Amino acid sequence: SGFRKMAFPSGKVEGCMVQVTCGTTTLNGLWLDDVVYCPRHVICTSEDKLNPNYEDLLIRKSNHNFLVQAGNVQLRVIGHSMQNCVLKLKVDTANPKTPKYKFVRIQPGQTFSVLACYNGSPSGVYQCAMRPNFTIKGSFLNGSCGSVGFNIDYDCVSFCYMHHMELPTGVHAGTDLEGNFYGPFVDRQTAQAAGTDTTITVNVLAWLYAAVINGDRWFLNRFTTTLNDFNLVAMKYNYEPLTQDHVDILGPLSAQTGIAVLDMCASLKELLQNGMNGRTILGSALLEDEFTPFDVVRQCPGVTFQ
Amino acid sequence: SGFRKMAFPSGKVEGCMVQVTCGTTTLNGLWLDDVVYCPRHVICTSEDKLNPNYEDLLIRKSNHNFLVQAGNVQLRVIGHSMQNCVLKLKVDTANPKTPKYKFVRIQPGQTFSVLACYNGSPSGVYQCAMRPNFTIKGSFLNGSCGSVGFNIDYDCVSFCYMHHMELPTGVHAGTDLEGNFYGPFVDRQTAQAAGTDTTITVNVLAWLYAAVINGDRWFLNRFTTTLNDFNLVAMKYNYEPLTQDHVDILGPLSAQTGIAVLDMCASLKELLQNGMNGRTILGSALLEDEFTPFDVVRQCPGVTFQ
């Protein structure tokens, strides 16, 4: 019983975190086999960030200009390259603790675990969701760039996020492990503002299903609605449109509770129109949208197959 | 920037989780040096739990009656003993991944990270607070008994909780690593109900300070109160009494915000009597009490020493 925001165990990722220093700037890198991945803006001075030419700065740098330290051992850089916004430093030593890994690009609305690190040392782990405006609301202090977001798919650690930037609103922006930013953000000091955000509708419904599984049933009603007329209310309250694919994803939760997805939509409609009536749902007085349907299944297994 | 519920990296604890099997019952154990710690109720059948005499059941058990598995490797048990409510199985082999560790007994209101495990394999990590009624609001499924709570204070893992049981209200109860239950709970099927809970006042204030640091200022007022007049309202809404020790602990946050602790108490006073009027504080519509002042300082460091 119980439902909590839960991150994946970070051990396999901790064994890959290193410290990368170029000039006066120090951040975190991801050491997989004989390659260290880190944000390319480490090669920039404070003045370079105003208008950096990364192709020029990369040529000007030498292998010895990059100091990579895995804890107490210094790793010798023997090659440096750039894939989009990520710097790739080939090192002398292959990481003996490299896990089975993949590079994946997640979609807005999906969640992952963030291992916040400083000086190449992990500091904390928490779950984050890619918002529709392609930002994440994490907790980062100075020296956190290079921290990675990941999911564990049983035996494979799928890295999906590398932390690059903090926006003026306090939210955070970064790239996938191929150097491609999530959203329209660039790794330079220019006027970039996160777009207006929306609520992840399919995540709210899955979160309501988790409540029903854990005994919270006051918000349930006898009403049913159609996908079209629910999406009308959803747009009226800045909710993402609900698609048939989203309904299919919610299939398992609807199967174990016996509550049709459109019946939960009728309950969600009334909650949006009349509020929460001063009550709470899974320890929240707001509708939570940072739990994916799989995230719910992870903590709410059915009784169908025990 | 940002403020999130953040757990410690679980790697050092992941390397200590093992599987302990007695008869048909399988749960998790903590492998430190040559001793495996697990809940003693693993030696009970389903009928035994109704009225177990653990001293007798231990006599009937042999070393070979306990099957301990460190992942895929079977550990040879060479001794079984009982320290209060925890079973201690001495094994032939010392765990090479044992970190610098201590056993500590935490206070109500203090927080720790829970590494939820199943069949000796870590599944997730999240932050929990010891409630005043000596329960925790975690997320546990079948086979989670033996999961441990911990804090890391620079290379040292302080174990403070082992999960034993779920109460009828859905909350969870367990012991320290010396086998002493938190609260008046016993490892037997009896009429045991968690007492009525109260809100951790010093944690709410620290959380309100974190909100001010992160830009939330609407709940602030020019009102002032005394510790006596605040505690009258606190008891009136089932809040823990605020002591002078609690006020001193909040000293750094009050200095960093320029808000006197008793002025924040006045803000909490008005928030308790009339609510938040449809606004939010750090993305919550409730007053959060699972963040200790140290947890806030950890995520909101001052500029005094840069």
Author numbering:
A (entry chain B), B (entry chain A): 1 to 306
Question: What does the study report here?
Answer:
The coronavirus 3C-like protease (3CLpro), also known as main protease (Mpro), plays a crucial role in processing two polyproteins (pp1a and pp1ab) encoded by the virus RNA genome. Inhibiting the catalytic activity of 3CLpro has been proven to be an effective strategy to block coronavirus replication. In this study, we have identified mutations in SARS-CoV-2 3CLpro that confer resistance to WU-04. To understand how these mutations affect the WU-04 sensitivity and the catalytic activity of 3CLpro, we solved the crystal structures of these mutants and aligned them with the crystal structure of the WT 3CLpro.
Unexpectedly, residues 45–51 in the crystal structure of the M49K/S301P double mutant have good electron density and the conformation is similar to that in the structure of the WT 3CLpro. Structural analysis revealed that the C-terminus of one molecule of the M49K/S301P double mutant was docked into the substrate-binding pocket of another molecule of this mutant, thus this structure may represent the post-cleavage state of the M49K/S301P double mutant. Thus, the M49K mutation has a greater effect on WU-04 binding than on 3CLpro substrate binding. The S301P mutation restricts the rotation of the C-terminal tail of 3CLpro, thereby perturbing the dimerization of 3CLpro. The S301P mutation alone slightly increased the IC50, but in combination with the M49K mutation, drastically increased the IC50 to greater than 5 µM. Specifically, the kcat/Km ratios of the double mutants, M49K/M165V and M49K/S301P, were only about one fifth and one seventh of that of the WT 3CLpro, respectively. Interestingly, though the M49K/S301P mutant showed stronger WU-04 resistance than the M165V mutant, its binding affinity to WU-04 was higher than that of the M165V mutant, indicating a resistant mechanism beyond the decreased WU-04 binding.
